[PDB]
Amino acid sequence: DNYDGTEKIPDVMPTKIPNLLVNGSSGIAVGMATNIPPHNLTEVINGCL
DNA sequence: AAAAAAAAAAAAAAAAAAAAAAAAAAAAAAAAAAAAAAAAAAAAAAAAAAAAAAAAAAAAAAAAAAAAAAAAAAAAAAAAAAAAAAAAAAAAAAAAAAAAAAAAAAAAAAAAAAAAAA
């Protein structure tokens, strides 16, 4: 649900691309901190296969 | 009383900055090992000193590698043009001590007010 409750948002996208390994990520939480480098799409798909 | 400049209304153009949260790097300032350097002790190889000696400069003189002369030929270096690197000369500057103008505390004394006595 939305913050107002008037609409709805997806909880997670039904992806076909491994977006986390491919595009990477970077963020600063309060206790944690993520830093994932990007990867090549063909190699990651080969690993998935 | 004339001139000039600020400011404010509302639709337009275009910008700038402070913090949180984790993880890694980069400056920049300290204790603290670690070795030069220096003062002040005892200690010990070198100059002195002397007598005694024999190894290499003189001297004779031949001769054999030599330095000047002659020639031919190759082409390194010097001076004149330009084009870059790198350092004193001179002038400028931002904090920084000096001076001057405005805010807060001070009481002396009185106007107005509030309150109560007989």
mmCIF file of C-alpha atoms (C1' of nucleotides) in Angstrom:
data_model
loop_
_atom_site.group_PDB
_atom_site.id
_atom_site.type_symbol
_atom_site.label_atom_id
_atom_site.label_comp_id
_atom_site.label_asym_id
_atom_site.label_seq_id
_atom_site.Cartn_x
_atom_site.Cartn_y
_atom_site.Cartn_z
ATOM 1 C CA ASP A 1 0.000 0.000 0.000
ATOM 2 C CA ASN A 2 0.845 3.680 -0.390
ATOM 3 C CA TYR A 3 1.635 5.991 2.529
ATOM 4 C CA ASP A 4 -1.793 7.612 2.099
ATOM 5 C CA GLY A 5 -3.354 4.246 1.218
ATOM 6 C CA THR A 6 -4.887 5.653 -1.983
ATOM 7 C CA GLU A 7 -2.647 3.583 -4.317
ATOM 8 C CA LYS A 8 -0.340 0.553 -4.373
ATOM 9 C CA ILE A 9 3.344 0.059 -5.223
ATOM 10 C CA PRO A 10 5.150 -3.234 -6.014
ATOM 11 C CA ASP A 11 7.071 -4.820 -3.171
ATOM 12 C CA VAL A 12 9.732 -6.067 -5.614
ATOM 13 C CA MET A 13 10.148 -5.850 -9.380
ATOM 14 C CA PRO A 14 9.786 -9.100 -11.422
ATOM 15 C CA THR A 15 13.224 -8.660 -12.942
ATOM 16 C CA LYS A 16 14.901 -10.637 -15.702
ATOM 17 C CA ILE A 17 18.305 -8.906 -15.322
ATOM 18 C CA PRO A 18 20.480 -9.687 -12.244
ATOM 19 C CA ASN A 19 20.469 -5.997 -11.396
ATOM 20 C CA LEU A 20 22.404 -6.166 -8.106
ATOM 21 C CA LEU A 21 25.529 -7.804 -9.529
ATOM 22 C CA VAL A 22 25.198 -6.044 -12.883
ATOM 23 C CA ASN A 23 24.663 -2.393 -11.897
ATOM 24 C CA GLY A 24 26.092 -2.697 -8.383
ATOM 25 C CA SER A 25 24.980 -0.600 -5.440
ATOM 26 C CA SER A 26 26.243 1.806 -2.797
ATOM 27 C CA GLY A 27 24.511 3.077 0.323
ATOM 28 C CA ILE A 28 25.072 4.142 3.921
ATOM 29 C CA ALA A 29 22.727 2.780 6.594
ATOM 30 C CA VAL A 30 22.903 3.508 10.334
ATOM 31 C CA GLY A 31 24.715 0.287 11.303
ATOM 32 C CA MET A 32 25.451 -1.317 7.932
ATOM 33 C CA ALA A 33 26.915 -0.047 4.665
ATOM 34 C CA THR A 34 26.700 -1.743 1.254
ATOM 35 C CA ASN A 35 29.193 -1.398 -1.596
ATOM 36 C CA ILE A 36 28.812 -3.853 -4.497
ATOM 37 C CA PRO A 37 30.743 -3.301 -7.771
ATOM 38 C CA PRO A 38 29.070 -3.606 -11.192
ATOM 39 C CA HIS A 39 29.600 -6.651 -13.408
ATOM 40 C CA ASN A 40 29.249 -7.593 -17.067
ATOM 41 C CA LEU A 41 25.810 -8.879 -18.019
ATOM 42 C CA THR A 42 26.922 -11.750 -20.273
ATOM 43 C CA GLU A 43 29.297 -13.197 -17.680
ATOM 44 C CA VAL A 44 26.723 -12.943 -14.890
ATOM 45 C CA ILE A 45 24.090 -14.612 -17.083
ATOM 46 C CA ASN A 46 26.607 -17.361 -17.872
ATOM 47 C CA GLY A 47 27.155 -17.840 -14.144
ATOM 48 C CA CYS A 48 23.398 -18.004 -13.574
ATOM 49 C CA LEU A 49 23.035 -20.616 -16.324
ATOM 50 C "C1'" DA B 1 10.676 73.300 -3.532
ATOM 51 C "C1'" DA B 2 13.793 70.509 -7.465
ATOM 52 C "C1'" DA B 3 16.766 66.169 -8.351
ATOM 53 C "C1'" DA B 4 18.241 61.431 -7.084
ATOM 54 C "C1'" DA B 5 18.000 56.868 -5.136
ATOM 55 C "C1'" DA B 6 15.657 52.745 -2.164
ATOM 56 C "C1'" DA B 7 11.959 49.827 -1.483
ATOM 57 C "C1'" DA B 8 7.727 47.192 -2.410
ATOM 58 C "C1'" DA B 9 4.133 44.982 -5.151
ATOM 59 C "C1'" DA B 10 4.115 39.841 -9.146
ATOM 60 C "C1'" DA B 11 5.439 36.805 -13.008
ATOM 61 C "C1'" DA B 12 10.141 35.732 -15.270
ATOM 62 C "C1'" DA B 13 15.752 34.461 -15.836
ATOM 63 C "C1'" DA B 14 19.673 32.120 -13.073
ATOM 64 C "C1'" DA B 15 22.255 30.371 -8.891
ATOM 65 C "C1'" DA B 16 24.223 28.900 -3.552
ATOM 66 C "C1'" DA B 17 24.767 26.113 1.462
ATOM 67 C "C1'" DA B 18 24.632 23.390 6.464
ATOM 68 C "C1'" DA B 19 24.052 18.601 8.670
ATOM 69 C "C1'" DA B 20 23.401 12.607 9.336
ATOM 70 C "C1'" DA B 21 24.919 7.866 8.456
ATOM 71 C "C1'" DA B 22 29.831 3.989 7.468
ATOM 72 C "C1'" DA B 23 34.454 2.937 5.390
ATOM 73 C "C1'" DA B 24 38.384 4.020 3.126
ATOM 74 C "C1'" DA B 25 42.176 7.139 2.115
ATOM 75 C "C1'" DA B 26 45.283 11.116 2.881
ATOM 76 C "C1'" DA B 27 47.549 15.131 5.889
ATOM 77 C "C1'" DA B 28 49.440 16.474 9.981
ATOM 78 C "C1'" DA B 29 50.809 16.429 14.409
ATOM 79 C "C1'" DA B 30 52.620 13.792 18.415
ATOM 80 C "C1'" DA B 31 55.822 9.657 21.664
ATOM 81 C "C1'" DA B 32 59.587 6.952 21.200
ATOM 82 C "C1'" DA B 33 63.491 3.759 19.229
ATOM 83 C "C1'" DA B 34 67.694 4.665 17.242
ATOM 84 C "C1'" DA B 35 71.889 6.412 15.974
ATOM 85 C "C1'" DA B 36 75.454 10.997 15.442
ATOM 86 C "C1'" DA B 37 77.737 14.045 18.320
ATOM 87 C "C1'" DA B 38 80.051 15.751 22.396
ATOM 88 C "C1'" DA B 39 82.432 15.751 27.422
ATOM 89 C "C1'" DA B 40 85.366 13.415 30.377
ATOM 90 C "C1'" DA B 41 88.306 9.029 32.354
ATOM 91 C "C1'" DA B 42 92.304 5.467 31.262
ATOM 92 C "C1'" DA B 43 94.970 3.613 28.241
ATOM 93 C "C1'" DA B 44 98.753 1.981 24.067
ATOM 94 C "C1'" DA B 45 100.761 2.413 18.755
ATOM 95 C "C1'" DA B 46 103.810 5.939 16.746
ATOM 96 C "C1'" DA B 47 107.641 9.221 16.598
ATOM 97 C "C1'" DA B 48 111.718 9.731 18.435
ATOM 98 C "C1'" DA B 49 116.269 8.234 18.739
ATOM 99 C "C1'" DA B 50 120.450 5.816 17.572
ATOM 100 C "C1'" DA B 51 123.566 2.686 15.287
ATOM 101 C "C1'" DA B 52 124.145 0.006 11.402
ATOM 102 C "C1'" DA B 53 123.635 -1.175 6.614
ATOM 103 C "C1'" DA B 54 123.350 -2.178 1.278
ATOM 104 C "C1'" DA B 55 119.968 -0.841 -3.453
ATOM 105 C "C1'" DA B 56 119.427 2.338 -7.038
ATOM 106 C "C1'" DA B 57 121.049 6.986 -9.370
ATOM 107 C "C1'" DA B 58 125.697 8.073 -11.989
ATOM 108 C "C1'" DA B 59 128.596 6.984 -15.702
ATOM 109 C "C1'" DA B 60 130.404 4.596 -20.488
ATOM 110 C "C1'" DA B 61 127.843 3.679 -24.977
ATOM 111 C "C1'" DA B 62 125.031 0.994 -28.651
ATOM 112 C "C1'" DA B 63 120.398 0.875 -30.912
ATOM 113 C "C1'" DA B 64 115.703 0.750 -31.506
ATOM 114 C "C1'" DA B 65 111.287 2.904 -30.762
ATOM 115 C "C1'" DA B 66 110.473 7.327 -31.745
ATOM 116 C "C1'" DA B 67 108.251 12.738 -32.934
ATOM 117 C "C1'" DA B 68 108.836 15.968 -36.886
ATOM 118 C "C1'" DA B 69 108.078 16.264 -42.004
ATOM 119 C "C1'" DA B 70 105.207 15.155 -46.058
ATOM 120 C "C1'" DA B 71 100.846 13.880 -47.981
ATOM 121 C "C1'" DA B 72 95.894 12.580 -48.491
ATOM 122 C "C1'" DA B 73 91.525 12.730 -46.823
ATOM 123 C "C1'" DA B 74 87.375 12.802 -42.987
ATOM 124 C "C1'" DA B 75 84.713 15.625 -40.767
ATOM 125 C "C1'" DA B 76 84.563 17.376 -34.685
ATOM 126 C "C1'" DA B 77 83.943 21.943 -33.021
ATOM 127 C "C1'" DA B 78 82.914 27.155 -33.174
ATOM 128 C "C1'" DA B 79 80.159 31.106 -33.951
ATOM 129 C "C1'" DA B 80 75.676 32.892 -35.574
ATOM 130 C "C1'" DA B 81 70.460 32.520 -35.751
ATOM 131 C "C1'" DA B 82 66.402 30.961 -32.883
ATOM 132 C "C1'" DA B 83 63.732 28.843 -29.008
ATOM 133 C "C1'" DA B 84 62.954 27.253 -23.714
ATOM 134 C "C1'" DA B 85 64.146 26.958 -18.254
ATOM 135 C "C1'" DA B 86 64.884 28.958 -14.268
ATOM 136 C "C1'" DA B 87 66.109 32.719 -10.876
ATOM 137 C "C1'" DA B 88 66.406 38.241 -8.447
ATOM 138 C "C1'" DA B 89 63.802 42.806 -8.623
ATOM 139 C "C1'" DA B 90 60.109 45.170 -7.506
ATOM 140 C "C1'" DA B 91 55.475 45.849 -6.052
ATOM 141 C "C1'" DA B 92 51.266 44.206 -3.624
ATOM 142 C "C1'" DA B 93 48.612 42.361 0.336
ATOM 143 C "C1'" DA B 94 45.566 40.289 4.922
ATOM 144 C "C1'" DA B 95 45.856 40.114 9.557
ATOM 145 C "C1'" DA B 96 46.580 43.232 13.160
ATOM 146 C "C1'" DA B 97 47.565 47.042 16.635
ATOM 147 C "C1'" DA B 98 45.448 51.639 17.113
ATOM 148 C "C1'" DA B 99 41.576 54.808 17.409
ATOM 149 C "C1'" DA B 100 36.558 56.383 17.768
ATOM 150 C "C1'" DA B 101 31.188 55.684 18.342
ATOM 151 C "C1'" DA B 102 27.164 53.144 20.350
ATOM 152 C "C1'" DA B 103 24.781 49.562 24.060
ATOM 153 C "C1'" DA B 104 24.071 48.241 29.075
ATOM 154 C "C1'" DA B 105 24.403 49.225 34.094
ATOM 155 C "C1'" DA B 106 24.066 52.702 37.382
ATOM 156 C "C1'" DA B 107 21.946 54.920 41.161
ATOM 157 C "C1'" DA B 108 19.831 60.779 42.846
ATOM 158 C "C1'" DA B 109 15.722 62.344 43.030
ATOM 159 C "C1'" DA B 110 10.724 63.286 41.767
ATOM 160 C "C1'" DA B 111 5.779 62.529 39.240
ATOM 161 C "C1'" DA B 112 2.288 59.812 39.369
ATOM 162 C "C1'" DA B 113 0.010 56.216 41.367
ATOM 163 C "C1'" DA B 114 -1.847 52.861 45.012
ATOM 164 C "C1'" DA B 115 -3.178 52.077 49.575
ATOM 165 C "C1'" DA B 116 -4.725 52.969 54.204
ATOM 166 C "C1'" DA B 117 -5.415 55.994 58.999
ATOM 167 C "C1'" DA B 118 -8.535 58.894 61.812
#
